[PDB]
């Protein structure tokens, strides 16, 4: 392994206005989008499961 | 039992409940002394145009208002603890009666001599006989001899309940797997009511306790007739 | 431009995703327990991992890559980790309380004795003794890793951290195996309850602590730590020590004294 | 702790400083009215004379108001203070709040 | 105690490494041997349907609802006894 | 022989509100006594006092559960 | 505390509107449910 | 950057007092209503 | 046994989950008109467990004596939640009440 | 200049207290609320057996 | 823009505003639940159904007022808004973790409202005792949803505790010692230490309840050798510190309000106030079993718990007398906030004294599980904690918003609430003395008059709450922007204007060591 | 026309507090006995007079004749 | 028994951490990590209060161990005085942009 | 005055009994005759008229002590408005009695109460102070 921390410091200090969670590049965007879709889809699914469990149908 | 517009405790039916009335009078007098002193002092602080807004020295007046409360607390604790220990002292009962809480009724077992047991259910409102008390009467009362030291043992066969009779100063939780003991001694014959005192589900409000205190000789006949 | 030394964090989505994953895991355990379904639960564990990954990733970017961890910021993190460990100690204290309450006053359903009738405790001198020597040895090897790092020695830091992780893994497989061989189960009354819940939460904390050490090992491979600035490593060592001490209390209380 | 006399003397000295500035005049008065007392005429006399060296007529009238205010419901104190200040009020041409109709609500 | 030890005239990594290889790992090796000796299959207890054990107040949420999570057929009887 | 029995006396081993163990100890004492008497061919009526005390103190459903469990071979206390 | 004059003064009549609307938002929905209690109580 | 100052440091608009009234009404009124509707849900079950 | 004693026991312990009359609707548990001389799990249009459906005993005084003492012992898997009636004499009276009442 | 309190304070006080009293007396006495007061000095006990 | 600001916040002021909005909405939920309780009791008979649906309401009332109303408002709302500003810090220590403490509460509250929607609800009491809360007497998901709701609120507050302690210890100006921080800062720090230590124990206990309900453990089930009373120990070891947690930040606010509206630069006896709060936080850990005096504990244990509980009156009396000594000699301004604080002082005192009556295990036998306990805790919560919150809200609302309230309306609001809460809870002393039990949907006829009066009281407090909404509306509707605030030299939170900019103290304060 | 006398000008708030704090005590202690004599002492005497010649058997015979007991007609 | 490979702060510290580090070596405190020591506080010897802008908030602990701190804005230009004890403060340029 | 937005940081004016000399003068911008009057103020105050003196006082201070201390009629509005709102509450209590509450139980009917009272007296409910103590058993009436 070689010490490549100076390169990363340069990338994360670049003056492009990006918040830290997106500053790594397009991969950050994808991961962010996956996480937020699963959390939001999941929360909607949990609301669905609430409504279902809220009535009896037997 | 309680009666309409009542302010304080139900009349004492046991010497220990009498002790608790006097101790509550002693404590409430103190509560009234402290609460009125605070209200008077607040009024005093708020009714003058004179001011003093510079720094005030806090090490002299602070002693009094630390030490006088401590003394007051001991004046409460001393008679409070006398009574706690009185209630715990050895008594020698002449009878032991068990009660089991259920959802939602009480059973009683008197098993010193015979296998006597029965259930005790609230009288529904629509079945009260004229002059009977809503939510308080039961079909089978807890018949007990008056003027006798009785060991009550309390448990449950399902959830927590709590067996209480305010007149006698009693409240003992009913915990499945556990056998809690309290002592009962009525100075008088009569009918003495109480109500389940631990939330136990749908009909918590609807599983009361009624003691029927009568001379030993009547208690005997009634026991025999209940077998 | 600020003239204090503290870190103004960029607005971040991970708190909201962390919160939502907690909703999904909890409502997911509900569905698994009552509606025979693992779906919500697996979504929530997924989002929970994704959230932890990106959150701590971002803390690494902020500190190693961006230089925000001034001594004042680092001191704050010291406090935060010490307070978090304190709260984990009080969490275990509840399980020890439960253990001692049940074992000091055994009820009649148990036969009025401890261990209960029908319970054959593990021998505290067999695998539990080995687990003990494994966690203790790992306290020694992590302290070697710390000193190597302060003295600037990359290779011995990595060897020592590697040994420490290997012992945590060894403990974890010893424990998994002892769980499989134990002739009592979690449903074997209050003995099985206190035993598996207390040592199970401990097992989980060993897996967490070992994973934190693995993160430190990878950050070290990538040269993140300087010989003077390596708070991720110290937090993981304090947590590792906390994990070792709880085991000592388990081993004395539950394996030795309660056998 | 000091005597009443020594407290009063320190305050008289404070306001008598020839080149007292406006900040010091304000600080002295706002400090002094925080105490549990109505200031002696000799202190108020020195503060009014400071207002004169500072060409500040309005603050002189305000100082007389605050003396009345410090006395709260003890209504005999302010007429006594005014009496004692009369020769200074006349020398400096200071009108009292009453003479200016500033006591009317 | 001290144990039998010695040092504070020098540099820490070297000592902690000495402790790791000279005391800590030898200890783990001895306990490992000690286990890989004083082990071997304890005979299975003998079933008694005790009511404080094999508690079932709700089915578990996996399998057929009646097996514990690390169920071992050799040593963990079900409420009705050992299986298969 | 020492009847007159009104109820179980105060027992200084169990002086507190929780009486669970007083019931249990007397229940065990009765059954241990009676097993030992039959084993050693002896009396059994010497066990009576313990039966009176447990019967006084013990909820009927406890006694009856413990009795079913002894007949089942699942009583957890040593007799 | 002192303040500037109200940028958009709310007159007595507008207060009466705001008060009324606020009270009705609490009272009508609850009032509706409590009025129809016995309908649900039909098991 | 974000707007600053009175009426700008909040997640709801106070530009129009009548829109504001409607929002506050739905906000507080929904929290106040919710337990009556849940009691009703439970009564309608049996 | 004693019918009106058995009436009280039925009101307090069973009426809440059972009705007795010809007609009377299924509540938590099946209606009971015509119980005696007859097989188990046969009340028209009630959903039994398979334990109660497939029990294969005939209700009469004798089989009700055993079952009411301990329902889940007699019918393992039962959905009837009821501990049971310990007293022989109370079981006799409840049965004598049900003998009369479940048949006009 | 008189303020709101100067102009309307007497009227708010008079009308508010009049309204408050009238509506509370009315609610307490005219619509069948069961107060369950004490029977003492008021009820004639009657045979119940 | 909106999403970055309000969902992704790392700013202490906006996160405090979020907590205040959440706590205000939860207070509406709590209030409705309190009216449903008092409607059920407001005449003899059954209004709703039996005790199951009644106690689902009583249990939610309590969880909502405590976990979603009082703690979020006091600690999340006033704590986040005020603590950084009072120590000249640029934000909290962990500004992104602070945002997670907030966002855990909506899902916690959703779980609570799911508990009440499925099955028949968790009609357990807010203490959640087994076996009533176990899987036979409360089969199905409700109580597990309730447990999970408590786990999330617990995590939210533990991480909030870590953030406040680390912020208050580490982020003061370097010359400012702990003995130079305001009493409100102290009060939040001490509350934080109580949260930090008490919530994990609650967490261990409700996890054991979850595993008894779903994994066949038997911590609390006698059949496996467990003990229902072990759950009560664990619960109350959290639950007594929990009541000090609900009041301590209120004590801090009251010291600020009483000082401010007395025209003083500081509270009387500052070091005595710090000592009293530290003494109260410590003693609040060693008294929990006074919630268990009827469970069957030995007499010596009951004697110890009686005595240790009373001792807490001494440091608390020092705070009440020090507030009076603060008023002494003040230039009293009768603002609405001061009126809240004076009502707090007297009414909290009354509630603390009935707590001392309850501390005596001998008398508590007859008062336990009766309305006398309910009277006690509503005097210290529905007057105490709530009055300190309303006093703090009226006092600081122009700082947070930039706009002033109409003071006449706010005084009107105080008067109505004062009458309502006293009419509601005062008669509950008589009901408790005379034997009326807690958690009852109906009562023997003799208890009619006081129940009737108490329910009428609850409607007057409703009218106050409605009026409060209108008053906040009027303020935002009128837009009177703050000009001058007095006493800024001893109230640093005001010195950046109203509202302060999004970033404050970007340049820290200068403080000499001297 | 005759000077006004010099009045007391110092410690006016403190003088006020020292005068009134005595009364605060007396009114609150003051109530003193009131609860004590009007409520407590009356209670002690009520229980002592009730039981001084109480006849528990005559009390029971009265209740029995009134038909109140399940155990005793 | 040893070799190297671990970077130092001097080689690898960056951003504000590095600025604080380099400034500490020169005895400088641009990010306000240390408490300043008071001067005699007279008009002739005022406390010098660095600011990067035209005003800064001062807290004055007027006597040692006061629990009450007196706060006020100090403005660019002529020295101002604590309103409680009168000690003098004067704003001076930051330097601070270093 | 183009002092408005950095203004919170500037010294400001307050009328308060306990801070008689505020940090700034009330009037910020003077007219010509007010400036002439400030210059005249540097000479003997005896040469100033009453009106000039009041003017100098009003340049420096907004309200006199007597103004800032005046009592107001606010309590009338506050007490009367509180009573109005508590009276409105009774309207709600009327509606709830009329439309939420059904039948009170039959045990509150006058005949039930007459018989229940006798039975309470026959069992001597609270015979020491609370209830039956108030019954005269000899004369068979309530005690006077
Ligand atoms: C704000 C919340 C709060 C606070 C601060 C307190 C404070 C105290 N409480 Fe309370 N309490 C609760 C909320 C709180 N309580 C709740 C919610 C419950 C019920 C839980 C449940 O079951 O659901 C409860 C229950 C509870 C019980 C259990 C009763 C029972 O269930 O049977 C007891 C018993 O000791 C108790 C006592 C006390 C005491 C001694 C104090 C002390 O801290 C009070 C100290 C204050 C003073 C004494 C007044 C000021 C002092 C002076 C003016 C000095 C002079 C005074 C004297 C010399 C006496 N409380
Ligand atoms: C190998 C050692 C490492 C341990 C990790 C192992 C895997 C499971 C997950 C661990 C999570 C930790 C503890 C949760 C409690 C129960 C698990 C205890 C440890 C364990 O794994 O116990 C097993 C049973 O597990 C079971 O039920 C398994 C059921 C899993 C259900 C999870 C329940 C989730 C509980 C909620 C946790 C809430 C946390 C609260 C947060 C704090 C808030 C501040 C033992 O197996 P057995 O066959 O019964 O006996 C062995 C006989 N041969
Ligand atoms: C616990 C706190 C809650 C206190 C609430 C008390 C306040 C009451 C407010 C009014 O509520 C309304 O009352 C009407 C009746 O007055 C209802 O109409 C009902 O009655 C009308 C007339 O009888 C019918 O016309 C309607 O169709 C029928 O819904 C209407 O739905 C309901 O919104
Ligand atoms: Cu049984 Cu409550
Ligand atoms: O709780 O007090
Ligand atoms: Cu407590
Ligand atoms: Mg209880
Ligand atoms: Na280090
Ligand atoms: Na009701
Ligand atoms: Zn100073």
Residue numbers in the entry:
A (entry chain J): 1 to 58
B (entry chain B): 1 to 227
C (entry chain C): 3 to 261
D (entry chain E): 5 to 109
E (entry chain G): 1 to 84
F (entry chain H): 7 to 85
G (entry chain M): 1 to 43
H (entry chain L): 2 to 47
Give the published text.
Mitochondrial cytochrome c oxidase (CcO) transfers electrons from cytochrome c (Cyt.c) to O2 to generate H2O, a process coupled to proton pumping. CcO initially accepts electrons from cytochrome c (Cyt.c) to reduce a dioxygen molecule (Ferguson‐Miller & Babcock, 1996; Yoshikawa & Shimada, 2015). Electron transfer (ET) from CuA to the O2 reduction center is coupled to proton pumping across the membrane. To elucidate the mechanism of electron transfer, we determined the structure of the mammalian Cyt.c–CcO complex at 2.0‐Å resolution and identified an electron transfer pathway from Cyt.c to CcO.
Therefore, in this study, we optimized the three‐dimensional (3D) crystallization conditions for ferri‐Cyt.c and oxidized CcO at high pH and solved the X‐ray structure of the complex at 2.0‐Å resolution. The asymmetric unit of the monoclinic lattice contains a dimer consisting of two complexes of CcO and Cyt.c. CcO interacts with Cyt.c mainly via subunit II, with 94% of the contact surface of CcO with Cyt.c belonging to subunit II, and 5 and 1% of it belonging to subunits VIb and I, respectively. The distance between the iron atom of heme c and the copper atom of CuA is 23.0 Å. The dominant ET pathway from the heme c iron to CuA of CcO was explored using the Pathways plugin for VMD (Humphrey et al, 1996; Balabin et al, 2012). The calculations suggest that the most probable ET pathway, as shown in Figs 2 and EV2, proceeds through the iron atom of heme c (Cyt.c)‐Cys14 (Cyt.c)‐Lys13 (Cyt.c)‐Tyr105 (subunit II of CcO)‐Met207 (subunit II of CcO)‐CuA. Prominent inter‐molecular interactions in this region include six hydrogen bonds or salt bridges between CcO and Cyt.c. Lys8 (Cyt.c) interacts with Asp139 of subunit II (CcO) via a salt bridge, Gln12 (Cyt.c) forms hydrogen bonds with Asp139 (CcO subunit II), Lys13 (Cyt.c) forms hydrogen bonds with Tyr105 and Tyr121 (CcO subunit II) and a salt bridge with Asp119 (CcO subunit II), and Lys87 (Cyt.c) forms hydrogen bonds with Ser117 (CcO subunit II). In the Cyt.c–CcO complex system, water molecules on the surfaces of each protein are preserved to form three layers upon docking, but each protein specifically interacts via the long arms of side chains. Cyt.c in the Cyt.c–CcO complex undergoes a large fluctuation, using the regions interacting with CcO as a fulcrum.
